[PDB]
Amino acid sequence: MYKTEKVDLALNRNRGDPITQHFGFGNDEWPKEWLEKLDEDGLPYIGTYVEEGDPICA
Amino acid sequence: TSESIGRNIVKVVYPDKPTSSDYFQWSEEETLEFLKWMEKQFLPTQTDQKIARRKLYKIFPLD
Amino acid sequence: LKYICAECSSKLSLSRTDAVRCKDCGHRILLKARTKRLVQFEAR
Amino acid sequence: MFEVPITLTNRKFAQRRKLKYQYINYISRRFDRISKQQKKRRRERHWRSVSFEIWRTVSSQNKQPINKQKMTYHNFKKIEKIPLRKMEIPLLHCTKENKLYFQSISRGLEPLKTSTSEVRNYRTRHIVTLTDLLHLNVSRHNWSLAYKIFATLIRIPGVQIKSLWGIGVEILDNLSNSSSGLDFLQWMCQIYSSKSRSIVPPFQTGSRTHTAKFAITYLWSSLINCQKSMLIDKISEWVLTPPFMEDAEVWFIYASCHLLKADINQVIKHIHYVRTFLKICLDKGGFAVPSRLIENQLKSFES
Ligand SMILES: [Zn+2]
DSSP, rough: OOOOOOOOOSSSSOOOOOOOOOOSOOOOOOSSSGTTTBBBSOOOOOOOOOOOOSSOOO | OHHHHHHHHHHTTTTTSSHHHHHHHHEEEEEEEHHHOOOOSSSSSSOOOOHHHHHHHHTSSOO | OEEESSSSEEEEOOOOOOOOOOOTTTTOOEEEEOOOOOOOOOOO | OOOOSOOOOTTTTHHHHHHHHHHHHHHHHHHHHHHHHHOOOOOOOOOOSSOOOOOOOOOOOOOOOOOOOOOOOOHHHHHHHHHHHHHHHHHHSHHHHHHHHHHHHTOOOOOOSGOOOOOOOHHHHHHHHHHHHHHHHHHEEEEEHHHHHHHHHHHOOOOOOHHHHHHHHHHHHHHHSSSSSHHHHHHHHHHHOOOOOSSSSSSSSOBBOOOOOHHHHHHHHHHHHHTTOOEEEEHHHHHHHHHHHHEOOHHHHHHHHHHHTOOOHHHHHHHHHHHHHHHHHHHHOOOOOOOOHHHHHHHHHHH
8 A cells, every 4th residue: 555645844934934934954953763754855765664653754 | 346346435434534435436336346345344243022033134034 | 766756767875955856857755775785584 | 424324333332321321320329319231331321201283282271399509619519529439440441542531521522523523434325325315315206316325225124214214204305215214104103113323203103002103104194195086094094003002193194094985875974983983092191173073074074
């Protein structure tokens, strides 16, 4: 079975607004286990096994 | 020319009148190249709401 | 070279605040591409 | 030779304000006697008032019945003689130019040189020229240039400006780009309506009691952006939004929104509505048509 989900973080922004949220990682301190699922862009590496609760996006 | 435009820029911070009346008698292009030199060389400036002013200023284009 | 153009197929990479578009086409739709990494499976 | 949109370069002007209001205190104190600290400066400067649509003034009636001479030469120099020496004490601490200023203003002479004329900084003088060119271009209908000036200006860290009516009418006549006069005004009210002096007369103000010019002008001018129509329930939706109760002018804005929406029992409710807000606009410092004229339009409606 295949399921396609759309992640769209322009969902809140009020039309051509300044952009608050950008795919990727910041320089604050965040888990690091995250890089097991996610590439540098904040998108998940293709092929990755993913079960409930895992990151699919950063 | 680069020179006279410069001498205008010095005229602005010369202590005595008339030279400031001299900036009075300058012309739209002088004022324009002035604001240019202002945004260029008064980045050599001195000394929540902050991001609110990044979006606030990003309300009107910086170009 | 993490990404691929969906229209012209040119392989290309991005950076921090970069033109989310093909540097050849100008098409604004990019497919991710994927890199040597360990995934483990049981042959059953 | 024009007002500068910067906080005035400091020290000597402030210590002169000291000498001035301190001597003022000693003279007026002994004067009330004869009629019988940052904070000292603060109380001192404190107890003192700080056919067309004319927002009329308060004319002459219900006021006093004169005075007859209080101050001969001998009597004045009586009041003056002592507070001048008390002044002799801290005059010894201030600077020689400052002391001279104290001597001359206390003789009654008025100083030749402005605060600007004796001021003495690169970045601020450059911002002065920037802002100036903004105001000039906005006067010159040069909305393109003026827009460049505005963007480059707001970029800068250096000074906040009350200058706000400058930008209200500025972006107003600009039409060019940037999140416009209304956006600026509602920003002014959103930032400066919460706990969150020299510079301030009424045309730029704080939101404890009336912020006047910019608010009422976006109000009316937005109702004229409905004159574009024949938006209203928007304008009075965000005139509905704010609590800053000392207005009434937004009560007449409100009732004007109901007269404009009244141009079937719905229209009735709008006419009863304007009938209500005209009196809850008799609440405060009155904006009055003969208002039997308002009602006469409302009977042309009652048709
Ligand atoms: Zn392409």
